[PDB]
């Protein structure tokens with residue numbers, strides 16, 4: 220029984236989701252207190268409750284404290300099972316966050332699984348569901364993890380409606396991933412996703428990307444208007460050792476040029492370091508690498524989220540992380 | 554103009570307080586948006602406003618957005634002035650947070666200064682005002698920074714009422730401070746402060762510390778009932794190369810033994826690693842070494858607070874921190 224203080228690091232939902240995952244994998248139960256204690260609406264909100272129930276269902280846990288506003292939670296996992304799971308988060312609800320809770324555990328399930336989640340997929344506060352398939356999965360495959368995500372329908376905040384489905388197989392063995400240098404840029408590509416939003420908005424965004432970067436491809440993907448309004452712009456940087464993809468989800472009163480220019484600045488900050496992975500992808504490689512007992516990547520700067528994922532992993536798993544930050548590059552390794 | 558998002562890293566008052574200090578010292582103005590945006594009560598609160606106000610008063614600043622609830626502030630410092638100031642936070646408000654906002658700028662003031670603040674000195678959520686003289690100041694003195702704090706009266710949470718006074722002289726020259734290893738134990742000293750709490754409670758507390766450590770001294774300090782109720786227990790670990798002091802502020806209905814065991818726990822934690830400084834103290838040396846331009850320390854683990862301080866510092870000052878975390882300890886060095 221691990222006792223977690225939910226007020227470590229940035230002190231929000233990340234602590235809870237990472238522990239839920241690690242509890243399921245390791246079978247170690249846990250209690251967490253001060254869940255989001257300083258936030259406007261403190262304790263477990265409806266989205267956290269959704270994540271806890273999904274976890275509960277895939278491993279038959281026994282739970283105490285799973286109620287709105289609760290600041291305490293006790294989770295005692297059972298055996299992780301395979302099979303066809305369908306969850307509904309709806310609302311703002313990020314698909315991504317349910318998936319990040321349950322996917323790692325399903326890697327240890329007793330058989331293959333399929334996880335369907337309906338809810339938001341594209342929201343300006345966080346990387347879209349599309350980041351799983353396009354950036355995360357190919358690095359999971361090299362670690363020896365079998366996970367294939369399909370966006371079946373986008374749900375653009377504030378609208379829900381999106382549909383994501385991931386197929387997963389139990390891992391046989393973990394490989395050691397070693398990322399240091401990106402390597403030379405092989406190609407960049409820009410894509411605009413549109414649903415119920417005029418075409419010219421994608422032509423302008425694509426032209427702002429094209430003003431700064433040489434693009435191998437300039438794609439405009441139009442979705443059915445029933446999924447809109449929505450606009451997402453992404454830029455892929457395929458280097459010799461890694462493929463990264465950066466995303467800006469467009470907001471209601473923001474213009475095309477401002478959405479695009481935020482994307483351009485994020486890409487130039489990645490290119491300005493020699494680090495192989497961006498901040499957010501760095502947070503997601505922590506667990507799979509912990510799980511393999513070895514591996515490394517470079518990230519520009521350690522972040523609070525990186526520290527917190529590392530701390531929660533180290534409570535459940537006997538691995539230790541080293542962090543050697545020295546020349547505008549931080550090497551993260553087992 | 555330096556633009557800061559106040560939602561980075563930890564997302565709270567710390568970012569604001571360090572940018573105030575750094576803007577004053579260097580003369581660089583800044584704006585900060587999304588001040589405390591995720592919090593229960595977001596943006597500028599009373600305590601934050603008291604800190605912007607004291608800062609505006611020591612340097613004659615041009616300020617926009619200094620209001621309750623604002624999530625945006627713009628601050629354009631004038632010349633830091635030496636003089637004698639008095640700030641009242643009252644409430645529970647901690648004197649340390651005002652002090653930590655103006656003292657560093659006063660090291661670059663055009664003459665000596667004296668800061669007096671009134672408000673809370675001893676609260677369960679943070680090291681007492683007493684940490685400044687007992688811990689930090691000897692260290693600032695080796696960095697070439699001359700300041701001396703006095704506890705004139707204690708204000709124990711949830712009451713204010715305490716008074717702290719600091720004297721500062723502008724720095725003439727910075728020095729490189731290098732902390733590696735703690736070195737060997739030299740002595741350990743226990744102390745309990747009481748205000749309107751039976752002496753038996755202090756005795757119990759010293760006797761629990763005495764149960765885990767060899768105490769070279771064991772003082773008990775009774776304050777007038779005036780300043781209570783309150784009870785602060787502390788334990789100093791003087792090693793050859795560094796001295797630390799860890800404190801607990803006893804909470805309303807919490808046993809003597811439970812107060813003291815919390816304190817034994819933080820001390821054994823610090824002694825479970827070979828780092829020279831605990832997390833809190835490492836957070837305090839970032840700015841002063843950045844200003845000297847060179848320096849290093851070891852801390853067991855990097856925390857969010859430490860990262861936040863280093864990133865605000867590197868936005869204003871032409872320095873870069875390196876973090877080498879390897880065998881249970883992190884070396885933090887500035888270049």
Ligand SMILES: OSC[C@@H](O)[C@H](O)CS
Nearest residue numbers: 782783784803804805807
């Ligand atoms: O834990 S010691 C007790 C003393 O500090 C008072 O009860 C504070 S309100």
